[PDB]
């Protein structure tokens, strides 16, 4: 009796700038994150993805590594600056890498899930305004259409955007991520142009009518808890919940922005980008939703720079990210989507994982027992989601290997495989061996 069906997809995930390296090889030009990493202080210790895990050169070994673990699906992102290193200038050599990457995956029985945009916007695009420029909808559409045309016979599962909350609010309001702006109004406009660009790709994808091929989007979602019973903390929680979750779930799946947040934001910034025709493109029917889940937020009333909600530390065990380990919110979010937003639409966990202080023992092993127990606890919640009727199709662990964790640089290790960056040596962590056994047995 299986807890995960034979059709269930046990997978792992990466992103192009986090693992590839070869940042200027074969015609790749800079992305906003190459640029951001070279601005003083914007990435911890001035780390950058010049080399990363060198997955661009080592991909055959990395696919062979995944085969030997039993991995059934691999979620990766395609580097826009590799494909169009300049506006209107296609680079065949860049496509060739994803063609041979994909071919190696298929020969090794691994199903490719390709993320179209995972934050590595071409610098030429940002120099024209980037996501603040409404014309990015066409540039993104042409980019997506090129991928569908050249790879659509071999990649059958497509994700338009990874975590637009990060590309918008974290990049243009908080400013921790590239391009690092700090203007709420720009963040709101960016969030709309991202969703509109996603809708353009979906429209193009449907026009092509490719056989047995599916499209969706990936959202990082949390569950928000008020710190107290008070009405002021409940209001703070509604703000945080709409800030993180509802601002993207409502337009995608209801066809409108959450009206309370339209009202709230409207006291501080312009919200005049909303209109009916844009929202119809944004709310097109998807084949699946990918969920990125890591932690919950406990908020109380106040304002410390962001909005009118202050996140607090409730006092339980956290990862090296400072993120609380709270597995039950994974079930609560999945069930909330089933009840209020996605109904019986296929759902995927496109990212879940944890960063811990991994050390290689003198015998060559990594005993990351905290990561093993982390993943055990969350797969148990996925198993409970399935038992209660949830349409969960797969689970992508973040990450296959230690990589470049954005503004943290290489200081945070998410992999089930350890990477010694001086030698690029890969070392299976105990969590990888645990994952391999979970895939073989399919019971937890």
- Residues known to be catalytic: 163, 351
* Cβ at position 68, least distance to Na ion in Å: 24
| Of the candidates 157, 153, 158, 191, the residue with the CA atom closest to the CA atom of residue 172 | 191
Q: HSE, CB side, 13 Å, CA atoms: give it for residue 397.
A: 32
Which of residues 218 and 431 has its CB atom nearest to Na ion in the complex? 218
Q: With binding defined as CB under 5 A, does residue 285 bind Na ion?
A: yes
* CB 53, min distance to Na ion, A: 8
Q: Which CB atom, from 77 or from 295, has the smaller least distance to Na ion? A: 77
Structural tokens at position 282: 């944004």
Closer residue to Na ion (CB): 21 or 85: 21
- Cβ-based nearer residue to Na ion, 198 or 371: 198
What would the two tokens of residue 273 be? 């980008």
Residues annotated within the binding site for substrate are 18, 118, 162, 294, 398, 405-406
Residue 286 as a binder of Na ion (CB under 5 A): the answer is yes
Q: How far apart are CA 232 and CA 399, in angstroms?
A: 38
What contacts 172, CB < 8 A, 6 or more positions away?
A: 131, 179, 181, 182, 183, 186, 187, 190
**Residue 311 · residue 238 · CB < 8 Å:** no
Give the residue with the Cβ less far from Na ion, 37 or 329: 37
- Indicate if the alpha-carbon torsion angle 395, 404, 416, 223 is positive or negative: negative
Q: How far is the CB of 205 from Na ion (least distance, A)?
A: 13
Whether the Cβ atoms of residue 184 and residue 268 lie closer than 8 Å to each other: yes
Owner of token pair 């350890």: 418
Least distance between Na ion and beta carbon 23 (Å)? 5
Contact letters for Na ion, residues 382-401 (x by CB under 5 A):
--------------------
- Binding residues for Na ion, how many (CB under 5 A)? 11
Nearest residue to Na ion, by Cβ distance, number only: 49
Q: For residues 145 and 152, give the distance between their C-alpha atoms in angstroms, rounded to a whole number.
A: 9
* Residue for token pair 């380990």: 325
- Closest separation between CB of residue 409 and Na ion, Å? 9
**CA proximity to 307, closest of 255, 249, 260:** 260
Q: Which of 17, 148, 205, 293 binds Na ion (CB under 5 A)?
A: 17
Least CB distance from residue 286 to Na ion, whole Å? 3
Stretch that binds Na ion, among 110-118, 178-186, 284-292, 354-362 (CB under 5 A): 284-292
- DSSP result, 260-313: HHHHHHHTTS--TT--HHHHHHHTPPPSEEEEE----EEEES--SSSSS-EEE-
Cis-peptide, bond into residue 399, ω within 30° of zero: yes
Q: Which is nearer to Na ion, 46 or 149 (CB)?
A: 46
Sequence ranges of the binding site: 18, 118, 162, 294, 398, 405-406
Task: State both tokens at 174.
Answer: 């908080």
Strand pairing report for 425-428 and 417-420: antiparallel
Contact track, Na ion, 37-56, x by CB under 5 A? xx-------x-xx--x----
The candidate with the shortest Cα–Cα distance to 377, out of 330, 315, 417, is 330
Contact status: 20 vs Na ion (CB under 5 A): yes
Given the rule CB under 5 A, which residues bind Na ion?
17, 20-21, 37-38, 46, 48-49, 52, 285-286
């Amino acid at each position: 009796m299986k807890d995960f069906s034979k059709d269930f997809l046990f997978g792992v995930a990466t992103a192009s700038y986090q693992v590839e390296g070869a940042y200027n090889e074969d015609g790749r030009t800079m992305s906003i994150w190459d640029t951001f990493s070279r601005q003083d202080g914007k990435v911890y210790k001035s780390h950058n993805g010049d080399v990363a895990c060198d997955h661009y050169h080592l991909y055959k070994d990395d696919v062979k590594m995944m085969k030997d673990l039993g991995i059934e699906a691999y979620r990766f992102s395609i580097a826009w600056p590799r494909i169009f290193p300049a506006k209107g200038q296609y680079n065949p050599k860049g496509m060739d890498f994803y063609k041979r990457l994909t071919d190696e995956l298929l020969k090794n029985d691994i199903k490719p899930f390709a993320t179209i945009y995972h934050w590595d916007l071409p610098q030429w695009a940002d120099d024209l305004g980037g996501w603040l420029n409404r014309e990015i909808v066409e540039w993104y559409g042409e980019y997506a259409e090129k991928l569908f045309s050249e790879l659509g016979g071999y990649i059958k599962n497509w994700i338009t955007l990874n975590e637009p909350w990060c590309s918008s609010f974290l990049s243009y309001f908080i400013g921790e991520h590239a391009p690092g702006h700090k203007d709420l109004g720009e963040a709101l406009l960016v969030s709309h142009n991202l969703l509109l660009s996603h809708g353009k790709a979906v429209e193009i994808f449907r026009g092509l009518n490719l056989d047995d091929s599916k499209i969706g989007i990936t959202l990082n979602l949390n569950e928000v808890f008020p710190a107290s019973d008070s009405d002021d903390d409940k209001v703070a929680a509604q703000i945080a919940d709409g800030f993180q979750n509802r601002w993207f779930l409502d337009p995608l799946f209801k066809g409108k922005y959450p009206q309370d947040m339209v009202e709230y934001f409207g006291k501080y910034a312009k919200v005049d980008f909303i209109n009916d025709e844009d929202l119809k493109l944004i709310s097109q029917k998807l084949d699946f939703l990918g969920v990125n889940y890591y932690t919950r937020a406990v908020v109380q009333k106040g304002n410390d720079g962001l909005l009118d909600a202050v996140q607090i530390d409730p006092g339980n065990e956290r990862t090296e990210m400072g993120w609380e380990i709270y597995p039950e919110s994974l079930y609560n979010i999945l069930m909330r989507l089933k009840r209020e937003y996605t109904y019986d639409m296929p759902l995927y966990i496109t990212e879940n994982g944890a960063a811990f202080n991994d050390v290689v023992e003198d015998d060559g092993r990594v005993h990351d027992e905290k990561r093993v127990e982390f993943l055990k606890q969350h797969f148990k919640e996925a198993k409970r989601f399935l038992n209660d009727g949830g349409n969960l199709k797969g689970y992508f662990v973040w990450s296959l290997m230690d990589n470049f964790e954005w503004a943290h640089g290489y200081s945070k290790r998410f992999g089930i495989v350890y990477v010694d960056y001086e030698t690029e040596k890969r070392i299976l962590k105990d969590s990888a061996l645990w994952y391999k056994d979970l895939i073989s047995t399919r019971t937890i």
